[PDB]
Paper text:
EBOV is a typical non-segmented negative-sense single-stranded RNA (−ssRNA) virus. Similar to other −ssRNA viruses, the RNA genome of EBOV cannot exist as a naked form, but must be encapsidated by NP and further form a ribonucleoprotein (RNP) complex together with RdRp. Previous studies have demonstrated that N-terminal truncation of EBOV NP resulted the loss-of-function in NP-NP interaction and the first 450 amino-acid of EBOV NP, forming the core domain, is sufficient for the formation of nucleocapsid-like structures and viral genome replication. In particular, this region was revealed to exert the both the function of RNA binding and further NP oligomerization to form high-order RNP.
The best construct with the highest expression yield and biochemical features covers the region of residue 36–351 of EBOV NP (named NPcore hereafter). In the structure of EBOV NPcore, one molecule is observed in the crystallographic asymmetric unit. All residues of EBOV NPcore polypeptide were be built into the final model, except three short gaps (residues A123–S126, E139–T143, K257–R263), and one loop region covering A326–V334 cannot be traced due to the lack of interpretable electron density, indicating their intrinsic structural flexibility. EBOV NPcore is featured by two relatively separate portions, an N-lobe (V36–R240), and a C-lobe (F241–E351). Both two domains are predominantly composed of α-helices, in which the N-lobe consisted of thirteen α-helices and two β-strands and the C-lobe consisted of seven α-helices. The major positive-charged crevice is located in the interface of N-lobe and C-lobe, in which K160, K171, R174, and K248 contribute the most essential positive charge. An additional minor positive-charged region is adjacent to the major crevice and is consisted by R205, K211, and R298. In EBOV NPcore, the hydrophobic pocket is comprised by Helix-14, Helix-15, and Helix-19, a number of hydrophobic residues contributed for the formation of this pocket, including V247, V250, I254, L255, L264, A268, V273, V277, F280, L284, L287, and L316. However, this hydrophobic pocket in occupied by P protein in NiV NP, but is accommodated by Helix-20, which is consisted by residues from N325 to E351, in EBOV NPcore. In the structure of EBOV NPcore alone reported in this work, Helix-20 folds towards and interacts with the hydrophobic pocket on the interface of the C-lobe of EBOV NPcore to form a compact structure.
Numbering used by the authors: 35 to 122, 127 to 138, 144 to 256, 262 to 325, 335 to 350
The structure:
Amino acid sequence: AVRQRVIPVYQVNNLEEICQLIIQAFEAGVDFQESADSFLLMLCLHHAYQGDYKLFLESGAVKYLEGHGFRFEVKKRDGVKRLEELLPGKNIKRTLAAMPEANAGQFLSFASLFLPKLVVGEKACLEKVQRQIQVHAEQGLIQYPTAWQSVGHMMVIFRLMRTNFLIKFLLIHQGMHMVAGHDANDAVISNSVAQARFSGLLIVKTVLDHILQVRLHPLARTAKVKNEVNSFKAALSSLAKHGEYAPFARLLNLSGVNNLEHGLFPQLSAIALGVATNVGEQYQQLREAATEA
């Protein structure tokens, strides 16, 4: 973890125009490889920071990433009219060269719809997106282009979200840190991020909600389940290190999250099921209940 992930930050006077090209390319499923991060960042820069590079670079998003394995490199690029001109191989330039209804905010809010069920699989995730689109449409909150509501387009964005850390991180951060009087796209993003809390971490949510009482639920005090309580406590201690991102650890593939796999805790899960029918703070609460047992 000594070596950093380096992300070029392309500074253009063209940003809205370049974002339209970026959106067009992602829709066509262009495989940007190592450059995808840089182009997704530019969308976030335009939408969340009103194109203000200085404020983006001193933002809490960037401060966190710089402290956790990333380095950002500003490259000033005057006179760019085509994405090809920002590419730092062979076939991507051809694809972009062949390039002949929305905006960056819309692209990002649509992408955020994939967060709540991303880790559950394509079928479940796409069904969730379709239902959410109809909810937002009925509340009059947002409407997406005709082209984006095909199963085919959703499969493209699903794969983009599944594989790209930075866009998930920036959406999640945005969802927790909006500027006053936020717009419809930000409302959708913040809603998506709220829905995504503890996605892929069912055992954490349910243990903290149903087994925590503070003491452990009486069924979680037996010596038979003591191995599971100890294992959970250790795993939760490590999760708490991720601070406000802990509920999203499975979404963001953060360290130590494999230790919280559901299957690793059958006895606690069974207890939680019987009952039902920040993270740093709750770890301290769990520490307290455990010690008492």
